[PDB]
């Protein structure tokens, strides 16, 4: 059988989940002559032939499209042609921005199997048995695909560990199918707003979330910042009301803290997104009211009391 | 000039929430339903797009659940939805996101919107998958995860900004109609937390128990349970020795 994957790349670069793929895929297969067959899409992806010639890939097809990066029309028709090509078992996406533009819609159209944000994944004899979450986390839901010789899955960002070393996979060239796309690719951008500290090098964070309440009690939580020589960092429902700038947020759509050594998360649930960008922090320590929240569940140390409280006797015994 | 927004009421459990008899939910008393958080966003970026309009802009809210929806479609016509749909039988039961996204496009076809909004993700299943269903089965333009949307009543092109990992953003142009999935703080919606809502059937629709359901789905739930997670080490006492423990940590991290 075949494993499909397909890669990422975006403004010239490979997006490193590609390789956690290709893991998953190497690490599901019931085979040793199973195959796994790689796609990069995009007019330029040639130049990503070294990057995923890689340990684990058996086949790396470059796919050559109308759009430099991802576009849902053209994404969609050359993965609905990459599984009519090579008739895959399984499909495994990246549960990632540009996967949300149309994996869903892929599985919509014909009969296959499909599940999202899917962090375990196995075979039980022939039959692939995935494990995704349920009610914000608070359950594991488990899943299968009674009937489908095809399955779809997105699969969650740093859960599965990529191989290492090189690869000599038989790389071929296609043309993605000839539709014309309903959307054309504009400038990228980023946002203005405040941005003296890059908070990707700091070692000390201090980092606030919804539970802060109003924007006039994010004073108090940079002068308890100042005085313990952290960071101020904070979670997205912080940064989107304009209180702190969107070079502060931690986790997907804002930055991941590799330097992190410390850090304190106050009035955040602990929400994957927010993961993404602090779950790797060798010492957590979660401060919230909520002992079911999710934060808990990767905090070292866990606080179940009011931030405030909390905040005003740290600063005093700093003093 | 019609704006429709898809909307799910979203579960979220109570504590000591337990596993039903045959293993496949979460017992329903242990259950708090609201508007999911995502629809907050998408329904005032409609009702924005409806006031900067000298135009009129209909926004129709639409559901696909059972009668305890009735309480959130309620809620978006007093914040000023023009109209709201709740889609349901019995046998819609266990449908999962692609199913939803078919059930959906069959209101949508009879009610011919310009543009079709639906939230990034719900806050329970976390699915980020019925909306572009949706797109798929209306076969329309679509994008996920808009964060701004310039757009005017009747244009055949929008340009969106969609909100990528790593504190950036795309600037696309999309042609209308489009479904587009809408980002958090994509606005700052007003109402942070006698017309009735009209109620439709299956057989309203065209669809029969055989169009939907679990049967119908594109997996099937083995089981639902409690996993074993990580546990923190909880710092017992007073305010006083809490936050000294936290200056413990805090000196030892410093050393
Ligand atoms: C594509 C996409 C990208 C995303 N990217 C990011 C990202 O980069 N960063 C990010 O953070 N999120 C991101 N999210 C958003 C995410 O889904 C959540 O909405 C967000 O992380 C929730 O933030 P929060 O924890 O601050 O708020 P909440 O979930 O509402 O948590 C508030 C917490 O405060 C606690 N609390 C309330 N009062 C007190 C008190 N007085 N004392 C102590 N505790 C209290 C509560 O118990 C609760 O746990 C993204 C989502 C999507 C779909
Ligand atoms: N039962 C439903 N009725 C109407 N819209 C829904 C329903 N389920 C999901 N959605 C839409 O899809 C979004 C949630 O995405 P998902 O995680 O894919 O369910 C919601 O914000 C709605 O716009």
Known sequence: ?319 | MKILVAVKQTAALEEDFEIREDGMDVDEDFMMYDLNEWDDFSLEEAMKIKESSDTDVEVVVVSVGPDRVDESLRKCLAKGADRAVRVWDDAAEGSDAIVVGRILTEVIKKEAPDMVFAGVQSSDQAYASTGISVASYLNWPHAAVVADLQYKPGDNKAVIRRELEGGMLQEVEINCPAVLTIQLGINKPRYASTKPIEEVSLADIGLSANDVGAAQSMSRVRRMYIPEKGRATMIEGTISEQAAKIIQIINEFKG
Not at chain 1, 30 to 35: F, R
Not at chain 1, 52 to 80: H, M, Q
Not at chain 1, 205 to 217: A, L, P, V
């Open chain 1, 1 to 319: 059988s075949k494993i499909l994957v397909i890669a990422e790349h975006r403004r010239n670069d490979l997006r490193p989940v590609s390789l956690e793929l290709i893991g998953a895929a190497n690490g599901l297969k019931k085979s040793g002559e199973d195959k796994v067959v790689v796609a990069v899409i995009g007019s330029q992806a040639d130049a990503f032939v070294p990057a995923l010639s890689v340990n684990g890939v058996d086949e790396l097809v470059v796919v050559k499209g109308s759009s430099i990066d991802f576009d849902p029309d053209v994404f969609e028709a050359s993965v609905s042609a990459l599984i009519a090509a090579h008739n895959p078992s399984v499909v495994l996406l990246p549960h990632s921005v540009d996967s949300l533009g149309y994996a869903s819609s892929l599985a919509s159209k014909t009969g296959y199997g499909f599940a999202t944000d899917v962090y375990i994944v196995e075979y039980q004899g022939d039959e692939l048995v995935a494990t995704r979450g349920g009610y914000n986390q608070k359950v594991n839901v488990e899943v299968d695909f009674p009937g489908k010789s095809t399955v779809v899955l997105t699969i969650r960002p740093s859960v599965f560990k990529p191989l290492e070393g090189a690869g000599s996979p038989v790389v071929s060239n296609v043309d993605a199918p000839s539709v014309q796309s309903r959307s054309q690719n504009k400038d990228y951008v980023e946002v203005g707003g405040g941005n003296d500290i890059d908070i990707t090098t700091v070692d000390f964070i201090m980092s606030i979330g919804r539970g802060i309440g109003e924007e006039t009690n994010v004073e108090q939580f940079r002068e308890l910042a100042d005085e313990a020589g952290a960071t101020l960092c904070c979670s997205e429902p912080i940064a989107d009301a304009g209180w702190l700038p969107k070079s502060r947020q931690v986790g997907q759509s804002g930055k991941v803290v590799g330097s992190c050594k410390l850090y304190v998360a106050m009035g955040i649930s602990g929400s994957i997104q927010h993961m993404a960008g602090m779950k790797h922090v060798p010492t957590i320590i979660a401060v919230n009211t909520d002992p079911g929240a999710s934060i808990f569940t990767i905090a070292k140390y866990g606080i179940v009391a009011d931030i405030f409280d909390i905040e005003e006797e740290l600063k005093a015994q700093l003093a």
